[model samples]
Target chain A: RPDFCLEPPYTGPCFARIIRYFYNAKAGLCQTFVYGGCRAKRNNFKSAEDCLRTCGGA
Target chain B: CGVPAIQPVLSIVNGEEAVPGSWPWQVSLQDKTGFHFCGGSLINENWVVTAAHCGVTTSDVVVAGEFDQGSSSEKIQKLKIAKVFKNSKYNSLTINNDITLLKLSTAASFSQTVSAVCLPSASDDFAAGTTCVTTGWGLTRYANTPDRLQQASLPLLSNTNCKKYWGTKIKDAMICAGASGVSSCMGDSGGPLVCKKNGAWTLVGIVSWGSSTCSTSTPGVYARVTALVNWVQQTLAAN
Candidate 1:
């Protein structure tokens, strides 16, 4: 649980559609995830570069 | 737990220069040139705590009871370092688990301007919105470096709310505080984040890392003292 980069992007049931990025540990790259303004989590990032940087992804 | 002698006072929001000897436990980590490079705090008579990023150079000197780096104070005691113990999990890239302990070659004597700050117990918890203060000689409001130390008050940010800004990268072992104007900056690394509890000041956070500019608006990040209290106790006991 300490490795937060491994966690999946968590978007709750809220209908708010905010485009965000996340680090996909399986792919070793940053990917897009639709963010629901509710239930915000740590895996969310505004930019691919920031996701890669924060999550140690390529 | 150690108690500060002169009641403490803010590189912190609307920072104001502190009164002389306001923070007795404040430590100045200097390089070979006697430059005050980083801010730290004396947790005990012999051990000073700071961020691991401050480095573990044996040549660096530790100055206790220092108020203004530009002016001389009678209470300043410059000591040699015996050893440096960086956290085993510290990551320079991610800046996680950023903490370090330095053992002075000679124990620092408590005086009017020198004292040890009390370390919070492992179970000590700070709820969000709790008022806390951080002191250092770091950049002021993103301005030129100041020789006199400054202290600013900030509120504890719950991790859940903190993630809104920093994301999941803010680990449990790390704590966040500050807002748009008041935050720790460069030269303030490895300093103390203190909160008044039960009529005494307790060391609650160790300045780890944070934003580059205060106007850009970022929360001050620090190593959670409660999470590392046991480690400090065990390490000091063994040393």
Candidate 2:
């Protein structure tokens, strides 16, 4: 499966950071950050390393 | 003698109400709070097809054999999703291969108001300009929801024409339907675009995305179902 990157910053109420990743066929992995309390989708991951480990590429 | 088949001819342009039990294969995917976000189609006793871009999760549940959201009927059946099988090739960036198969925790009981739609053969191509029907309970106005399911008939556009309009963004695995003025809009994602063949309805596309403005001139793109038949069948077999 490909990684997903979240678009638009997290505006929801929450202190922790939630990261989202999307698989870019060319770039391998792309990502964005959101609030922790907000729910993330399947393509999101915890960190850059998590994205790379899940879908490969930095 | 058996009763004659009844074809639903209600409209969705400007959010027209569809007849009760008109679309037996239509299903709605609800979030943790039971809010409908996307639509899907029942393909078998335990399998449904939808758009991968909907970002489905195990927490979601599917409601099938539904027509009006405000009214309750015995035909309504709810099934918790056991697993979501998104196409591994699905590219979130470009939205390529934006298709997914959902496995229900239990097989659905078929009846007059609940049945699976037929799938097209690998070689089947309905040709461009063919009119197809799409149904959903998506927004009628900006930030507004409808109480009953709405449907619209849209003519398929040729890929060549769609490419000319959208440039390199369109992919072969995708099918285009309806111009910008009368196409599927927000909240209608993952709905089925079914075309009639020999008097039978065949699911041909999965509603993906289009212009954010919902322009009447832009064509709505969908993940071609015929192209992914093998994947769907394989996934069902293994699961």
For lDDT, the strongest prediction is 1
Query: How do the residues B1-239 of candidate 1 rate in per-residue lDDT, one tens digit apiece?
Result: 44555665433446788888888888888877777657788887899988776764688899987877888645578989999998898765566777889999999988878888888889988899998888888767543468788888889898988888889778877998887468777667788888977867788998766664543267777889898888889989999
Best by TM-score: 2
Each model's DockQ? 0.02, 0.05
Separate clash counts for every candidate: 5, 13
TM-scores of all predicted structures: 0.77, 0.78
The candidate that achieves the highest DockQ relative to the unseen native structure: 2
Tell me the docking grade of candidate 1.
incorrect
Model 1 spans with C-alpha error above 4 angstroms: A1-58, B9-13, B73-75
lDDT, candidate 1, equals 0.76
Interface RMSD of each: 15.9, 10.4
**Candidate 2 at residue B23, lDDT?**
77
